[PDB]
Structure formats: structure tokens, C-alpha cells
Write a protein that binds this ligand. Structure first.
Ligand SMILES: O=C(Nc1cncc2ccccc12)[C@@H]1CCNc2ccc(Cl)cc21
Ligand SMILES: O=C(Nc1cncc2ccccc12)[C@@H]1CCNc2ccc(Cl)cc21
Ligand SMILES: [Cl-]
Lengths: 305, 305
């Protein structure tokens, strides 16, 4: 019993975190095989960030301008190139701790673990969701750039996020490991803002199934709804539309609890229209949307890595 | 910016998790140097658990009755002893991945990371607090016994908890790494229940200071309180008494924000009376009590917004 915001074990990623320094800027890098990946803004001064020409700034740097420190060992940079908003530093040593890995680009609503790092040293691990507005509500301070997000699918680390920036509302923006930003953000110190966010409906439903599995049933009711009527309600409350794919994905949880997906939708509709009336669900007074259906099944079945 | 329930990176502990089997019972063990620590109830069947005589059950076991598996390698047990509710299995191989570590017994209110494991394989990491009633609200399924709780301030792992059991309310009980239970619990299937739990007041105050550091002040008021009047009110909401030690511990956060501890106590008193009136504090509609003053200082910026 119990249901916690749980991150994947971070050990496989901790063994890849390094410190990258270019001039006065120090941030984190991800060392996989003989390449260290880091935000390309490591080459910029604060003034360069106002309007950077990354190709021009990079051509002025040599391999020795990049200092890469892995623990108490200085790695030798033997090559450098840029791929979108990521800088790839070829080093003369393959990381002996490189796990089985892939680079995957995730969709909004998908969750991942973040290993927050400073000076190439992991400081903490937490679970995030890619918001529908493509930001993450992370917890990052200055020096955290280059920290990565990941999932583990069997014994393979799927890296999905690299941290680049904090927006004025305190939320975060980053790229996949191919350097493509999530969201309409640019790696420039210019006016940028998170768009209006919405709630990840399929995740709220998954979490309501987790609450039922854990014995919290007060919100269940005799009613059902159609997908069309439920989506009218979802639109009204700034909830993401629920698709037939989401309904299909919730099938296993629906079968385990005996509550049809549209029956759980009728509970959610009632919660949106009336609130919780002083009650909580899994210790929360808000509807939680940062657990996917897969996270719920995984946590309630004890999948190991 | 941001404020998340953050766990320590789990890698140093993942490299210590092993599977311990005695007969038909299998659970997790913690392999540090040449010793594997695990709950002594690994020697019990379900029938033995009503009134087990552990000395009598253990004297009937030899070293080769304990099977310890570390990855795909079977370790050889060369000695065994019981210390309180923990079984210590001496093995013929020192764990090459043994981090710098210590065993620390914590007090209620302290937080720690839990690396939930099954069959010696880590499944997830989450943050917990030792409740005032000496239970933890974990997320554990059958097979999770032997999973451990820890903190990693600096490069030293301080192991503070080993999981033994789940109480009827779905909360969890365990021991320190010397096998002494937290609370009045015993490793026996006898009628046991968690006592009435209370809110960890010093942690709620620490979290309100985190909210102020992160730029929110809506909940502050023009009032102060005496420590005794604060306690008289807080106890009516099932909050733990706030002691002068707690006031002293909140000194650094009080100095950074410029809000006196008793001034923050008055804000907490008002929040208990009014609720949040549709507002949230650090993304929560409830007062959070699983961040200590130390956790807030570690996670938050040293500069108030
Ligand atoms: O956002 C950035 N870094 C940070 C990242 N995360 C949390 C931070 C907290 C506090 C201060 C900085 C933080 C940097 C510096 C500001 N200008 C800027 C512009 C574009 C890009 Cl790609 C990066 C940046
Ligand atoms: O509590 C125990 N195990 C578990 C531990 N954690 C989460 C569980 C979830 C679901 C089922 C079991 C779980 C065991 C078995 C039950 N009786 C018992 C009595 C005393 C002792 Cl020390 C251990 C136990
Ligand atoms: Cl303590």
C-alpha cells in the first residue's frame, strides 16, 4: 500500500554526469561513450546570450577551451560539434559506466525523472511531467543547466530531457538529447513566457485509479458519461481532451478496479463541478496529473530495474 | 526556482541492494563491506510470525541456509548473527561498490529517501518522513522488506531505515540499521496499529519559509504569537507542539526571509483557521510537512526573490 511520487533509480545516470567549463561558465554534461553532451549556451557570456550567433561563437573555441571533469579526473576534449541546441564534446575516453541507452523525444503528459546536478555532481532526483505547454515544473537553481531527465524501459536508460533555462514564472525549459527544444523556446536571453497550461486528463484518471487501488473510493459514483460529453466538461475546466487512445491505455486499470474509463470520467466530471468537499484523494486536495497510466501500473506492480 | 519533493540520488544505495532467501522467504538485503543486513523475519514462515522465537528459529539455520544473490552472482554466507530485529550475514566478498556510509537513528520529523526494492532490484526512489507516530507513509508492496531509507549529505550515505512491515492502515514500520524498531512496533503478526498521527509543525513552518524564499507572501499577516499560544492553537488541529529547539532550528530561514519564527507561527495559525481560500502554496492546496528546515535550505536559493 501507499502511493508516492516516485522517480526511477538514478544510479545509471549518476555515472554519466560530468562538469563542463568554458571560460567563466560551468554547467553539467552527460558523458555517454566518448561524447559529452551539454547545452550549447556553455560557450556564451551573459552579453552573448542577448543575441547569440552560436556558429560564430563556437568557431572561436578550440578543444582545450572546454574543460570536462568526471569526478576528480580531467577528460581530454578531442573534438566538438553542435547539434541543434546541444554541444557535443568528443573526449579521448569512453565512459566505462555508460549504460544501455537511447535518446527519446517525449510528448506532453509523459513523465520522467530528473537528476538535478551542480558542478557535475548529482544533488537530487525528482519526478516531473512534460506540461501540455512544454514546460516542466522543475526545481533548479543557477548551475543546474545540463541536468537531464530520463526514464528506464527494462534495462535501457531513455534520456528525454536536458535542462537549459528557467522562464520568468519559475518553470523550466529544455531540449531532447538531440538539442531540439520542447516548446516554442529559444536559447537566448530575450522575453519568453510559458503559455497557459492545461491539466493532463489521462494522468488525473490514472491517479484516480491509483486512489481506488489504494482504498480511496469516496469519489466513485453510479454514473457514466460519453467521451463527447466528458470532453465538453474537460474543455471548460482547462483539462486536455481525452482521446480514444487515452481510454484504451486506461483499459488495464479499468479491468483491475472494475471501474469503466467513462465511469471514472463521470467521477472526474463531478470532482471538477463540485470540488472535493473537504476531502482528499491519496493525501492531496488537488487532482494530481503527474502520474501516467504506466507509472500507476508500474508502482502498483513493483517493476524493478 | 521551483520546489519539489526531492530524493537523494540513489546510485550509491542501488550498488548495495541484494536478494536474501531463506527457505521459501525472499526479501532485500543491504550489502556493505562483507556484511548483508536484512530483516530477521526472513527466517520465518507466515505461521511463525504470530509469536516467533527468533533465537530458536535462527539456531536451526546454518550459513548455507541463506542464499544471497548480488546481480547474477551468488555470494557465499560465511557467518550469521542477529542484532535486535536485523540479521547480519557475513559474506566472503566485500562489496566493491560500498560507499562511504554510517548508520544513523533518526527522530520523528526527519526526512529521508527510500529506495524501494523487490528481489534485490531497485524499483523506485521517493522521499519520506518519519511520522510523529513512528510510522512512514511509504509505497511498498509484498517483497519490499529490506528496502532502505537514507540521506546523502556530502558523499556519505547515512542509512536510517530498513523496511519491515505494513500496518493495517497501509502505513509502514521498520527499524534503524542496528535493528531497533522506530516506535512501539514489533516484528510479529500480532494486533498492532499506528497511533494517532499528527502534523510535523516545524516542517510546515520550514515549507512556509520555502514559499517566501520562492516569492510568495500572500499568507503572511501583521500578527505575532507567543510560543505557548501558538501551541495551544496548533494542537487543536492535531499539530505537533513546536519546541524552543524547533524555533532555534528555524533561525537561519527566519534571518534569510526577515520573518521572525513567531511571526511565521501567526501566519500558520491563520492558515489553520481560514484554509487557503482557493490559493496554493508551492503548488499545494494542503500544508506540507515532509520538508525539514535542513531540506529547505539545501533545495532553496540562498537569495530570497
Ligand atoms: O535560465 C538560465 N539558467 C537557469 C536555469 N535553471 C534555473 C535557473 C535559476 C536561476 C538562474 C538561472 C537558471 C540561463 C541564465 C539566464 N538566461 C538564460 C537565457 C537562455 C538560456 Cl537557454 C539560459 C539562460
Ligand atoms: O508486513 C509484511 N510485509 C509487507 C511490507 N511492506 C508492505 C507490504 C504490502 C503488502 C503486503 C505485505 C507487505 C509482512 C507480511 C505480513 N505480516 C508481517 C508481520 C510482521 C512483519 Cl515484521 C512483517 C510482515
Ligand atoms: Cl534526526
Amino acid at each position: 500500500s501507499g502511493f508516492r511520487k516516485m522517480a526511477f533509480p538514478s544510479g545509471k545516470v549518476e555515472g554519466c554526469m560530468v562538469q563542463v567549463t568554458c571560460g567563466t561558465t560551468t554547467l553539467n554534461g552527460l558523458w555517454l561513450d566518448d561524447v559529452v553532451y551539454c547545452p550549447r549556451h556553455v560557450i556564451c557570456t551573459s552579453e552573448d546570450m542577448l543575441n547569440p550567433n552560436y556558429e560564430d561563437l563556437l568557431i572561436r573555441k578550440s578543444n582545450h577551451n572546454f574543460l570536462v571533469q568526471a569526478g576528480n579526473v580531467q577528460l581530454r576534449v578531442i573534438g566538438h560539434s553542435m547539434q541543434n541546441c546541444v554541444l557535443k564534446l568528443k573526449v579521448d575516453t569512453a565512459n566505462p559506466k555508460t549504460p544501455k541507452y537511447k535518446f527519446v523525444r517525449i510528448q506532453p503528459g509523459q513523465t520522467f525523472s530528473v537528476l538535478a546536478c551542480y558542478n557535475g555532481s548529482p544533488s537530487g532526483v525528482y519526478q516531473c511531467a512534460m506540461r501540455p505547454n512544454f514546460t516542466i515544473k522543475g526545481s533548479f537553481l543557477n548551475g543546474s543547466c545540463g541536468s537531464v531527465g530520463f526514464n528506464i524501459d527494462y534495462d535501457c536508460v531513455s534520456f528525454c530531457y536536458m535542462h537549459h533555462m528557467e522562464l520568468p514564472t519559475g518553470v523550466h525549459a529544455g531540449t531532447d538529447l538531440e538539442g531540439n527544444f520542447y516548446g516554442p523556446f529559444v536559447d537566448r536571453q530575450t522575453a519568453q513566457a510559458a503559455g497557459t497550461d492545461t491539466t493532463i486528463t489521462v494522468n488525473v484518471l490514472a491517479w484516480l485509479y491509483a486512489a481506488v487501488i489504494n482504498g480511496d473510493r469516496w469519489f466513485l459514483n453510479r454514473f457514466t458519461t460519453t467521451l463527447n460529453d466528458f470532453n465538453l466538461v474537460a474543455m471548460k475546466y482547462n483539462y486536455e481532451p481525452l482521446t480514444q487512445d487515452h481510454v484504451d491505455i486506461l483499459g488495464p486499470l479499468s479491468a483491475q478496479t472494475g471501474i469503466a474509463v467513462l465511469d471514472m470520467c463521470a467521477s472526474l466530471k463531478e470532482l471538477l463541478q463540485n470540488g472535493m468537499n473537504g476531502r482528499t484523494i491519496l493525501g492531496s486536495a488537488l487532482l494530481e496529473d503527474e502520474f501516467t497510466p504506466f507509472d500507476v501500473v508500474r508502482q502498483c506492480s513493483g517493476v524493478t530495474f
